[PDB]
Subunit: 354 residues, 3 copies
């Protein structure tokens, strides 16, 4: 009732204007993605381009905070998520046939527009992607299609969790264990009402059954693996952090209090990459105190087993009265992907046509 919701016209407007920016930046990055291109440069180019487009809009309103809601992340092949390298980490260079996931977020007055898309580097004109890339992309895309049709008022998060497994299984792929699609609110990317992928027995017990309601907003995030689908750390350095507002702890230092002060000014409660910090070695230091006492929440770089592919589609959807209204999406082309398998289940075939 105090809360600013998509029940209000001005809020739909901010969501729609960040959505349009998220869609433009994503597409620009996909067009710039070819053999020999630096991932570091695409992460920099996206974060810069988010800032510049947020710069040009709502100029009359000089108090409104706007920018990055999720820093541009570029996770290739069996890498799951959250790769925004530092100027001094090893870079990754896109090879032909590389499977690329681009993930990013934009906000306007704290209303968050999250988008992620998967494609293949320099697919030869007149060909189709085939084999396990085709199987896992096709599968993740149909998972996003089933969620667009199931995440609506009156349905339960559990029905989406199950639809996802039957769809992914149809391609002998596997939704990554325990990943979460969060409810969004003003200034909150990580709402506690969630959809869980492919939960274990522990995760199924600890995760809360919920019913979607009109006026809620979700960042639906589909991550599907060609393999077993349990992501592991593999000592890549975490660059992406979020401040956790739920945690106080006075910091016994000078640098730490000073780094965690630039995190609050420049970013408040949104995720940020350690690369966005002018002076690298100084940020690398101010993080350790903060991260161990949980004031910052890490976004770790997880990997599936070498040779396997992970595909991603993330879209932000507003549960408007008239029906779910999608405000971000990638330039997916269904005809580019040939799989030898399809969905055989009659209920899911009919749902995906609906």
């Amino acid at each position: 009732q105090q809360e600013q919701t998509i029940a209000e016209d001005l809020v739909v407007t901010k969501y729609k204007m960040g959505g349009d920016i998220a869609n433009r930046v994503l597409r620009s990055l996909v067009e710039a993605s070819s053999s020999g291109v630096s991932v570091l440069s695409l992460c920099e180019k996206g974060d810069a381009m988010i800032m510049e487009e947020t710069g040009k809009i709502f100029k009359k309103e000089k108090e409104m905070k706007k920018g990055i809601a999720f820093p541009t992340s570029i996770s290739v092949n069996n890498c799951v998520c959250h790769f925004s390298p530092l100027k001094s980490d090893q870079d990754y260079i896109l090879k032909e046939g590389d499977l690329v996931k681009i993930d990013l977020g934009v906000h306007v007055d704290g209303f968050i527009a999250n988008v992620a898309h998967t494609f293949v580097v320099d697919v030869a004109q007149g060909t189709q992607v085939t084999g396990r890339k085709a199987d896992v992309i096709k599968a993740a895309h149909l998972c996003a299609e089933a969620a667009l049709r199931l995440v609506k008022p009156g349905n339960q998060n559990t029905q989406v969790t199950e639809a996802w497994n039957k769809v992914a299984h149809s391609f002998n792929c596997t939704p990554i264990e325990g990943m979460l699609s969060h409810q969004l609110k003003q200034h909150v990317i990580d709402g506690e009402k969630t959809i869980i992928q492919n939960p274990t027995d522990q995760q199924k017990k600890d995760h809360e059954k919920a019913e979607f309601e009109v006026h809620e907003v979700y960042a639906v995030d589909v991550l599907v693996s060609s393999g077993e689908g349990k992501a592991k750390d593999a000592g890549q350095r975490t660059t992406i952090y979020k401040r956790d507002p739920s945690k106080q702890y006075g910091l016994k230092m000078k640098t730490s209090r000073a780094f965690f002060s630039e995190v609050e000014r420049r970013f408040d409660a949104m995720p940020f990459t350690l690369r966005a910090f002018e002076d690298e070695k100084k940020a690398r230091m101010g993080v350790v105190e903060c991260a161990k006492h949980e004031l910052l929440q890490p976004f770790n770089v997880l990997y599936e087993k070498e040779g396997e592919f992970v595909a991603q589609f993330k879209f932000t959807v507003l549960l408007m009265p008239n029906g779910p209204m999608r405000i971000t999406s990638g330039p997916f082309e269904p005809d580019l992907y040939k799989s030898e398998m399809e969905v055989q289940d009659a209920e899911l075939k009919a749902l995906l046509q609906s």
Copy 2:
């Protein structure tokens, strides 16, 4: 007082009911082929509506939800409302039978009604041909015309008149007298109506009306290859509705615990006698209740034999942005080849949009 589609929660309830009506409808059309029992299709629909409405808005333990119009499957010259009792005659679908499937869903009284015509087992790569195609094309283009004419500021009469020229283009006739009703919460049979191809008496019996924003209509197209009169052929009537504008103490003991059941289970929504524990006790307790006008019947009317009746029924919300259709059959216009076409310049332009 009246809850209208100017409330965000009401639109939501209409859409969740239509998503369900659309799903049960298609699942019934997939299940329809040579040798399946209409009885079992009617049982399957009604059970799918109850399962689907069972799964939604479950945090809201108190909310009524379920059948707004029990599944009816009216074949060839049958016009509507055929939902056989288990103890009556069944009907087995044949190849080339023209099938109308009518059903409705409600969520907290907000009704989503749909109906659709197809032909049984159309051989792959074949096209329906002849009178069946004429009348299915006609009824559909009558629905396309209504979708574009049922909008705020227009009159019911403009819709009546467009249906007459669209259906004459295929030498078909809208069945005279048939009504398309305004819907409101708990009301399937609003007084505000679109009439088809009315007689001079029916014209004077029926009120010109103007569509207004925030209204809901179950638009209902029934077009015949014949006459366009629908006559009783004494099939037993299986579908009745409580008439909430009516009292009567009733007296006979079966009668009162019968009508006690229709009030507990179905409140104001149409129901089939097939839905009772004992179809015989139900046929008996109706006979008192219906005489005294506490139940309206939904009669099975029939055209002349060898003639064909097509139906498309969709529920539409007159939203500010434009008509928002929440139900529809899966129409494929490529299935149907007619030697005739709509040729009126002004209706061709309407249908193109």
Copy 3:
């Protein structure tokens, strides 16, 4: 007090007028070919707007509705406002003529403006080529760019800038100083505007502005193959509107009758003098009115001989969910072939979004 698209009923009236402007424009486009009197097309289009508005919202008796901009048919290097008197030189359409059709509808003073460019009797399965295709493609890609840029948070200036880049790609120029007005109830000419290719001086005078939800714009793209200037040519002016801010008791009695017929038939919307039966009394009524600033003239304007001007106008509502276009013409892009194309990477991507 002011009625905005935040009201369900306002959005409805805009949509009902848009639906009509679309129907009329298309009918006029179909009716344009070699030998067609431009006078007849102006008559036909004004008569259609009155017939179509005559049929809607009949039960609301006090509700004013009809023409927001009289059908104007501006050919080749004519820019705008050609609506000849019965007694003027008529223009007969020739094969290969570039035609601009511009008209408006109002429902209760909610305005739906549209304009469309096409080429007369394009040879079946050819393509228009040369300057006519250059300028029609430039104007359409300008209209497409406006539709994606005129939205809450953006600046009228970014549109102005996109329009010189997009048009320069075809060696075409948006006509210097032409305006796209905000619309409100009974106001065709709101002060918040998008300016085309402003002069030196015009930039000083024109206000920068941010677009916001709930605003309405009649986006008017006017593009020239030549310099992008538009001069008078003492062609009779025929279109005027009443300035509702000026009031004056008139001396002569023909003048007052003239005024009464203007106020009654056209409130404060532009009208053509062609709509007055007594052509003489009206030309005399005007000079007393126009003398005392009671009418503002809409003068006919021309680019140079042999040059071509294209126009796409559309009326858009900045709803919360995104711009909602309620008018458009039937553009078929595959009809126009140009040696040139938009080569800026950001405009390429903006035009595909």
